[PDB]
Amino acid sequence: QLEESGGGLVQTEGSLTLTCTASGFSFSNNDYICWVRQAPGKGLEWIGCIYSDYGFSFFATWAKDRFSGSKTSSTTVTLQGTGLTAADTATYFCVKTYVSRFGYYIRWDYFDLWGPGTLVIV
Amino acid sequence: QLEESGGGLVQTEGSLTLTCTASGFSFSNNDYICWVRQAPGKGLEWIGCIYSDYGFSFFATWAKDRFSGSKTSSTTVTLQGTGLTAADTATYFCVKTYVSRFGYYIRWDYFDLWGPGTLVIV
Amino acid sequence: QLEESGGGLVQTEGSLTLTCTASGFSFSNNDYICWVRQAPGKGLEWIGCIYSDYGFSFFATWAKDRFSGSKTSSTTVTLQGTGLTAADTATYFCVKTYVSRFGYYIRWDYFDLWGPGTLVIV
Amino acid sequence: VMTQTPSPVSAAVGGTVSISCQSSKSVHNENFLSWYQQKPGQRPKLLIYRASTLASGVPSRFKGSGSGTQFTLTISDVQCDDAATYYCAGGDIQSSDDVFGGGTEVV
Amino acid sequence: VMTQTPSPVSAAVGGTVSISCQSSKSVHNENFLSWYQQKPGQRPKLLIYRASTLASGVPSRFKGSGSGTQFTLTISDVQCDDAATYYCAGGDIQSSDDVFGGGTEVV
Amino acid sequence: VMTQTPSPVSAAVGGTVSISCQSSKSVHNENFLSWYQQKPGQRPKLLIYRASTLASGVPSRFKGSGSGTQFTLTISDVQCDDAATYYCAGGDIQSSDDVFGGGTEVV
Amino acid sequence: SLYKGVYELQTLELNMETLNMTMPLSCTKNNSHHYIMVGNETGLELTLTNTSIINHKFCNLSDAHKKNLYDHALMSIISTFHLSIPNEAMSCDFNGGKISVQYNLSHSNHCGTVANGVLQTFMRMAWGGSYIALDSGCGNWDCIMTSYQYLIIQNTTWEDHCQFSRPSPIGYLGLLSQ
Amino acid sequence: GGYCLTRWMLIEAELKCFGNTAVAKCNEKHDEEFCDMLRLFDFNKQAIQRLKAPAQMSIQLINKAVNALINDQLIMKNHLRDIMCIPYCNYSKYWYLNHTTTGRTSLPKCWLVSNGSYLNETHFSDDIEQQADNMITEML
Amino acid sequence: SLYKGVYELQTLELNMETLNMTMPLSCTKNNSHHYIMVGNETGLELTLTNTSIINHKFCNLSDAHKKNLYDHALMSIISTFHLSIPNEAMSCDFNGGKISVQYNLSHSNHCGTVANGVLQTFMRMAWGGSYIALDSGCGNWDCIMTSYQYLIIQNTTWEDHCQFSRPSPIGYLGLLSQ
Amino acid sequence: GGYCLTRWMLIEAELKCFGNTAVAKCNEKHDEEFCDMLRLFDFNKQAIQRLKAPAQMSIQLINKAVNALINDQLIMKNHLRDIMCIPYCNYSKYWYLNHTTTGRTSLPKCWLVSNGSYLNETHFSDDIEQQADNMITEML
Amino acid sequence: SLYKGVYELQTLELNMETLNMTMPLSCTKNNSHHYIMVGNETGLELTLTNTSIINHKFCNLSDAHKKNLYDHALMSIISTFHLSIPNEAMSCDFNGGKISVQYNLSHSNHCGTVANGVLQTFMRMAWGGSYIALDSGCGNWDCIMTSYQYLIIQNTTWEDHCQFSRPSPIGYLGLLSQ
Amino acid sequence: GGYCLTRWMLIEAELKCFGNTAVAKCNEKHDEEFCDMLRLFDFNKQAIQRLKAPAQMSIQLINKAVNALINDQLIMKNHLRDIMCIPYCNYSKYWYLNHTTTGRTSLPKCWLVSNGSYLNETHFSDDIEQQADNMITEML
Ligand SMILES: *[C@@H]1O[C@H](CO[C@@H]2O[C@@H](C)[C@@H](O)[C@@H](O)[C@@H]2O)[C@@H](O[C@@H]2O[C@H](CO)[C@@H](O[C@@H]3O[C@H](CO)[C@@H](O)[C@H](O)[C@@H]3O)[C@H](O)[C@H]2NC(C)=O)[C@H](O)[C@H]1NC(C)=O
Ligand SMILES: *[C@@H]1O[C@H](CO[C@@H]2O[C@@H](C)[C@@H](O)[C@@H](O)[C@@H]2O)[C@@H](O[C@@H]2O[C@H](CO)[C@@H](O[C@@H]3O[C@H](CO)[C@@H](O)[C@H](O)[C@@H]3O)[C@H](O)[C@H]2NC(C)=O)[C@H](O)[C@H]1NC(C)=O
Ligand SMILES: *[C@@H]1O[C@H](CO)[C@@H](O[C@@H]2O[C@H](CO)[C@@H](O[C@@H]3O[C@H](CO)[C@@H](O)[C@H](O)[C@@H]3O)[C@H](O)[C@H]2NC(C)=O)[C@H](O)[C@H]1NC(C)=O
Ligand SMILES: *[C@@H]1O[C@H](CO)[C@@H](O[C@@H]2O[C@H](CO)[C@@H](O[C@@H]3O[C@H](CO)[C@@H](O)[C@H](O)[C@@H]3O)[C@H](O)[C@H]2NC(C)=O)[C@H](O)[C@H]1NC(C)=O
Ligand SMILES: *[C@@H]1O[C@H](CO)[C@@H](O[C@@H]2O[C@H](CO)[C@@H](O[C@@H]3O[C@H](CO)[C@@H](O)[C@H](O)[C@@H]3O)[C@H](O)[C@H]2NC(C)=O)[C@H](O)[C@H]1NC(C)=O
Ligand SMILES: *[C@@H]1O[C@H](CO)[C@@H](O[C@@H]2O[C@H](CO)[C@@H](O[C@@H]3O[C@H](CO)[C@@H](O)[C@H](O)[C@@H]3O)[C@H](O)[C@H]2NC(C)=O)[C@H](O)[C@H]1NC(C)=O
Ligand SMILES: *[C@@H]1O[C@H](CO)[C@@H](O[C@@H]2O[C@H](CO)[C@@H](O[C@@H]3O[C@H](CO)[C@@H](O)[C@H](O)[C@@H]3O)[C@H](O)[C@H]2NC(C)=O)[C@H](O)[C@H]1NC(C)=O
Ligand SMILES: *[C@@H]1O[C@H](CO)[C@@H](O[C@@H]2O[C@H](CO)[C@@H](O[C@@H]3O[C@H](CO)[C@@H](O)[C@H](O)[C@@H]3O)[C@H](O)[C@H]2NC(C)=O)[C@H](O)[C@H]1NC(C)=O
Ligand SMILES: *[C@@H]1O[C@H](CO)[C@@H](O[C@@H]2O[C@H](CO)[C@@H](O)[C@H](O)[C@H]2NC(C)=O)[C@H](O)[C@H]1NC(C)=O
Ligand SMILES: *[C@@H]1O[C@H](CO)[C@@H](O)[C@H](O)[C@H]1NC(C)=O
Ligand SMILES: *[C@@H]1O[C@H](CO)[C@@H](O)[C@H](O)[C@H]1NC(C)=O
Ligand SMILES: *[C@@H]1O[C@H](CO)[C@@H](O)[C@H](O)[C@H]1NC(C)=O
């Protein structure tokens, strides 16, 4: 499974690092960790995604200005956000993926395991 | 068949274009048209020969100084002679050929169809 | 067989050319002639060896300073020594060989026919 | 970019509901696909993927098809308990940041 | 350059006449050849070509052979109506402008 | 460089004598070898060579073996007439000038 | 932008199509159809499909290069494709019409598979595109997989369906650079 | 004008020429991708002008021409740069650093592509500056 | 003729024959016999004939390159001739003497025929001559026909019958420039 | 004298030599037909001097030497020029533009043949003049 | 030693071993065992012996390059060794373990024998050594004989037994320079 | 420093570098044995840094790299020099004529071996002196 931690309320013009922990299945060096958010009452959007062999950015054009990269240990992955504002309030989710196709032309196909969502208020 | 035209008497220090017309068989772009002459009472000699893809000279060492090239339409071929003298009087003939071998080293082998001769007096 | 000649007594600070003659078997251009010496009462040591296609030195580190090359006719081989001293007294022998292996890395393996020894006194 | 069937969707129990998605550009490979649903308060559940394959034991009632830019979803014998916001996902990274639909509410 | 049997040739009707040609240089290929005849006032008619092949249905009576520089012609059962000036042709273009013989008169 | 069993060797008639040689460096090929003997006043006679092969009809009584740096010789049913100084030879040219042993005296 | 005050970079682009009458050119259109121009009229289609078009495991190649060359240039192109694949199997026909071959990508999980081999050759001769279904890691020349199980190479009647990419001569020339 | 290519040879361009220094430099220098393309263009030109027939694109003729005209290593290196995610050139476009008053065109350099898109003059800044220095040196 | 006042063109000609002990050389004599020197004694004859010298459609090549090399250099030369011909059939023997092969030029009318293939190889290895029976158009590399139906390649006992042309090393070297 | 060829190596000629500048230029410059011939002459010379045997012309040895010594492209280009009726060189003769007072011999150029016959200095006028300028430039 | 006052010759030596993870390297140890590193763990042994290790005249090579590549890199290396030998026979197994081949040097007396062929290839891929049992004259490329009748090429479990010589990359690269 | 090789790349040596002139000369000049080795070292470096896997030494990848990076003629010529008892180079060692105050390192020359042993500076005296003159000429 995927377990969330690092949620709660933070102040605006601030920062927050979100965390996802592996359970049973440890992480490999592949693009198996990916992240999304949704403001309550809103649909889901991509924030960014995670590859463990080398730190990859993978950010939405939007997300990249406030969303920094991540730590990728065998069981714990940490996502640092900075310059956060109230509008960033959302339920955030860690999802296991087989989503990324790896030639230079990267494609999105098939998300698998979802973690419980965590509520982040800014 | 091969039909002749353009004969008759001309003056010396002059010119005359002789003509051969295709009948039934139109001309291809190959070396299928060739010409000879004989003064009455004399044997036959080569004047020059004709290839239709590109104007080729093909002249006897002798002929080349007074014998110019030719027009090669699908049915009509025209031979221009200039600087003609009385000694050029002969019966001229258009002959269909499969005569020329085409590697750079051109050879003479097998003339086929003959036209009626035409008498040219200078 | 192999026959010896050119022995006898010579003076010190001198020279002597030793000779071996082919009998029955003429010499080829290969390394089939080889030479050794032993002082009476002493064991055998290499002096040098002979290849007939081209004059080869083949000398013992020791021998090379006083032992010069040789003539190699089809039946007669001659060994020139110079700067000879009393200590060079020995019985000398001509031996037929298949001894030398010919890649650049020359090896010694299997001597065959021996000639009578010849006594040389300096 | 992705669009989707209008949000005010409902159905009676039994039979089907009509759900659809469309991209602005054909998908890299027409056998790439993700349909999923989210019941309010729940994490997303994958239903249909790739060449309309069902994921993780979800009911056989979930069906879909399509190619290029347009794909559909329908569920047989719809239950009141299937009420969820329904979504499509997939896309090329170079073509878009939005690899998820907005969601259609199905009552 | 080409030479030929002397010009004053004649024959009785029936049997044969001896006709021959010779080049200064061997022909490019010994299977290249043209024998032909011209009756006075007529256009030339090809008789024998390449490896002594008869052209255009001419009588089987026309025979010939040769190689290199020298070739011959003879006609069986010669007729008075075969009287013609007889010729050889062929050659290499680089070697000569004369690719025709002078002609031998056969009565 | 080559060494050898001590020089004061003797044997009774019948049975064997123990003779041995050793190089400082392994021979280029372990199948390279020469054992020979010299009776006083005589030219050398080859006995054993390469992979312990007997040369030129010498008695079957001559035996030997070895590899690398060390080889041995023994002669069955030794005769008084076999008394000779016994030697080894062979080697690489780059490794040594001494391609012969010193000799062991066998009575 | 002038370098050292006076040097401008002109950028010129080539009409690769101008070369169509002397040498084969490769152009990719959409994600399932790629092709080679084999002249000013005739072409060659490369299709990525999951359809078992050719079930002729035994290919009747007797006399394929001898008695009937429907297009001798085309048979030579098809043969070089095959020949540049390192190490295994193919189904085909080529009798009468149907001038085609099918390569099946089949494997029981490692690099250097039969699928990897055909895909490398395919990619190179369709180079300057063919990143489609480039299911490979970076630098992993021999780990290239694709999404479809079959590659069908067949004769076409057109030279002009080129959009998306450019009919580059590089593909065929590279194919033969052995 | 050295080897001039017309509007039917260049895509969406008028006829272009250059000074003979560049052709001499193409023939003397090794491992230049645009030179192989020029050889193919001239080859095509002549092959058709002489052939004058439907018997086009004989594979044996082109294969021999390729062995004679094309550097196999330029092709392989470029393909390996591609697999390695190293910018590589396809041959549609070339860079022509050119002196604007004298018309002095340097040997064309190929234009490298990164992740399916052309790189900027920024990425080629060093190559461009080096060539500009070389052009000055050669002119002086 | 002095260029710039001081530069003269010397013209030197090579004794290609000097190379006879290290590399094969090709010389053409008359229009039916061409040959390769394969040394300072032994040669190889190439004859253009219409005679069915070898009717051995089935060529007994078993052990041809293994049990008896009458001349191992010669068998290698003959084999490279064959190998450089693109795409079909040959008759031959090589058992005991008769160290020869016959190529038959046979066709039912187009370019790229079997005759064209053997003639191209033949011409190249006999290059610097062999314009004889060069029944081809200009630039038409693959349309080369000849006058004779057979080419017989056979072992000879001489090195010196060279007139007309020059025994150039180019032919054999070019033959192998694959 | 660089690489001197004797009367037994040149046909109907005495021994010829040249200054070392030309051998250095042969080794440094690429695609020069006479260089391949020189490599073959030296190869032949040594092969026999070392072999000293009837076991001559081993095909495997010459094939390897050819791969090492001979430029396959010079051969193929020349053969294609021939089929195309473009003057081409066989290797019997070479042009040696040579300074008559200093003995400065340029790298030999091959002598092109047209329709089975050698071309004149007229046809090579441009190549000759260009080489003469190059010789002057190198001397200064 | 300074040339022109200021130029010194530095002499640098390469850590050829550093290249072990990307390309095969050849090192000779003693006079009967020579080998190729095929990585940072696995190797390949070349042994000179008079022992008939492999009597499998019929080698079960079916599927050798297809169904089970114990080491696909290794099978490729072994195959290139074979392929670079000019012209004849070999015994081998390769089923399960025993990933090996035996070359027998057998001849009924001349140059260009089967033994000469295998030895030339062997020497080149083990070049920079392999003067051992170099029973050949100077310049006699095709007269190379050796002392042992068999060469056995087999899979090993180590990369590090290198003394005597250096694991040079030249051998394998030269082997394939066709 | 051009292409610097570390202590893990050189044997029993510390890290070594050279001025960029030498790398430019390596890339421009042909038939230099050390250049092929440099290409292999860089190739190895990248192949592992990118691969990050047990799937090492793929033969197909190295073979293609070799065709692209390695001059087959340098290898064959050196092997034939060996059979001919002509000094030849293995690649363990190279000569680096180097200016001691400026650090100007010439393109490395290979160190020839005779009868299994290295030749002296005496045997290379001419090559060394010639290179020293070339270094001076280039510096001026
Ligand atoms: C080809 O594309 C790659 C794509 O890499 C990036 O990450 C992917 C996961 C996607 O999200 C892509 O959309 C995204 O662009 C380019 O690689 C990246 O290049 C940039 C520089 O242009 C690198 O940034 C630097 O990283 C170093 C790290 O030490 C910092 O010190 C620098 O200050 C700077 O931030 C980025 O790390 C790199 N990404 C990866 C995963 O390596 C690539 O440049 C592009 N072009 C070419 C020729 O390959
Ligand atoms: C190789 O041989 C060809 C042979 O061409 C000629 O025509 C054949 C049919 C035979 O009769 C041959 O004996 C004869 O020479 C040479 O080609 C010819 O070259 C000349 C120039 O040397 C051309 O003349 C020019 O033509 C242009 C036409 O626009 C005029 O403007 C010029 O003023 C001048 O008259 C001639 O046209 C050309 N012939 C053909 C058919 O193309 C060829 O030069 C020769 N050498 C080489 C290297 O190929
Ligand atoms: C290309 O190769 C693939 C290999 O995957 C071929 O697909 C495979 O075909 C076989 C034979 O039809 C299938 O075997 C089946 O096994 C079951 C029992 O497990 C049996 O009940 C079936 O009747 C059949 O024998 C195999 O499953 C199938 N593999 C996959 C992944 O689908 C394919 O046929 C090849 N394509 C062609 C036409 O070359
Ligand atoms: C070499 O790689 C470059 C990429 O750097 C390729 O250039 C691209 O070519 C396509 C051709 O289809 C251009 O597409 C254009 O799209 C617009 C859409 O509105 C359409 O109107 C145009 O008519 C055209 O189809 C694309 O813009 C262009 N990219 C860049 C950066 O210039 C090039 O084709 C490749 N060449 C080879 C030989 O592979
Ligand atoms: C080289 O190939 C040519 C192909 O032309 C061979 O010549 C051909 O040989 C066949 C078989 O003898 C001839 O067939 C004949 O057909 C008639 C009926 O039409 C029949 O009555 C005859 O008994 C015979 O079967 C064919 O005509 C002939 N072709 C030509 C143009 O002459 C030739 O044999 C081959 N040469 C060798 C020996 O390889
Ligand atoms: C390269 O092509 C040239 C043609 O430009 C060839 O030169 C020609 O070689 C022949 C050799 O037989 C010379 O023939 C001579 O004929 C006279 C006749 O009286 C005879 O007395 C001589 O002894 C000799 O046989 C011919 O003149 C010469 N042509 C020219 C223009 O110099 C050359 O042989 C070809 N080289 C190669 C390697 O193919
Ligand atoms: C490698 O090739 C050599 C060829 O020398 C093979 O050695 C030879 O093997 C045959 C068959 O065993 C021996 O034949 C024998 O002939 C005698 C009569 O003369 C007979 O009584 C024996 O029973 C046997 O048939 C032959 O003498 C022998 N040659 C030598 C020099 O020893 C060897 O077997 C091959 N190695 C392998 C295993 O590939
Ligand atoms: C290229 O050829 C040279 C010969 O010029 C080879 O150099 C030699 O390499 C061996 C390596 O085993 C050195 O042996 C040494 O022996 C002493 C013995 O006391 C030992 O203590 C050392 O550890 C080492 O094993 C030998 O001295 C050396 N020779 C020279 C003249 O330097 C070189 O290895 C060959 N390289 C290649 C790639 O083939
Ligand atoms: C290199 O620069 C020169 C000079 O600016 C260019 O020459 C001009 O080309 C245009 C057509 O493209 C003509 O209308 C001008 O008259 C030319 N100028 C001069 C002074 O002649 C040249 O085209 C450029 N090279 C390339 C490859 O684009
Ligand atoms: C393929 O070739 C056959 C030859 O019989 C022809 O009839 C068919 O139309 C061709 N098909 C295409 C698509 O080119
Ligand atoms: C061809 O080789 C055989 C070998 O038995 C020999 O007898 C014959 O004389 C040779 N013939 C020619 C013409 O060289
Ligand atoms: C050779 O490969 C087999 C594969 O089954 C393995 O069991 C064996 O240990 C290997 N042997 C060596 C010496 O590497």
Residue numbers in the entry:
A (entry chain J), B (entry chain M), C (entry chain H): 3 to 124
D (entry chain K), E (entry chain N), F (entry chain L): 3 to 109
G (entry chain B), I (entry chain C), K (entry chain A): 60 to 146, 151 to 171, 178 to 247
H (entry chain b), J (entry chain c), L (entry chain a): 276 to 415
Sentences from the paper on this structure:
The glycoprotein complex (GPC) is expressed as a trimer on the viral surface and constitutes the sole target for NAbs. Each GPC protomer consists of two non-covalently bound subunits: the membrane-anchored GP2, which contains the fusion peptide, and GP1, which possesses receptor-binding sites for both alpha-dystroglycan and lysosome-associated membrane protein-1 (LAMP-1), the two receptors involved in viral entry and lysosomal escape, respectively. The development of a recombinant protein vaccine has been hampered by the instability of soluble Lassa virus glycoprotein complex (GPC) trimers, which disassemble into monomeric subunits after expression. Here, we use two-component protein nanoparticles consisting of trimeric and pentameric subunits to stabilize GPC in a trimeric conformation.
To obtain detailed structural information of the epitope of this new NAb, we performed cryo-EM studies using GPC-I53-50A in complex with the LAVA01 Fab. Initial attempts revealed that most trimers disassembled into monomers upon complex formation, resulting in highly heterogeneous 2D-classes, which could not be used to reconstruct a 3D-map. To resolve this problem, we chemically cross-linked GPC-I53-50A with glutaraldehyde prior to complexing with the LAVA01 Fab. Data processing resulted in a 4.41 Å map of the complex, from which we derived an atomic model. Inspection of the model showed that LAVA01 binds to a previously unknown neutralizing epitope comprising elements of GP1 and GP2 within a single protomer and can bind the GPC trimer at the maximum stoichiometry of 3. The main peptidic components of the epitope are β5, β6, L1, and HR1. Moreover, the antibody makes extensive contacts with the N109 glycan, through the HCDR2 and LCDR1 loops, and with the N390 glycan, through the HCDR2 and HCDR3 loops. The latter explains the strong glycan-dependent neutralization of LAVA01. Consistent with the epitope location, LAVA01 competed with LAMP-1 binding in a BLI experiment. Collectively, neutralization assays and cryo-EM work showed that we have isolated a relatively broad NAb, elicited after vaccination, that targets a previously undefined site of vulnerability on LASV GPC.
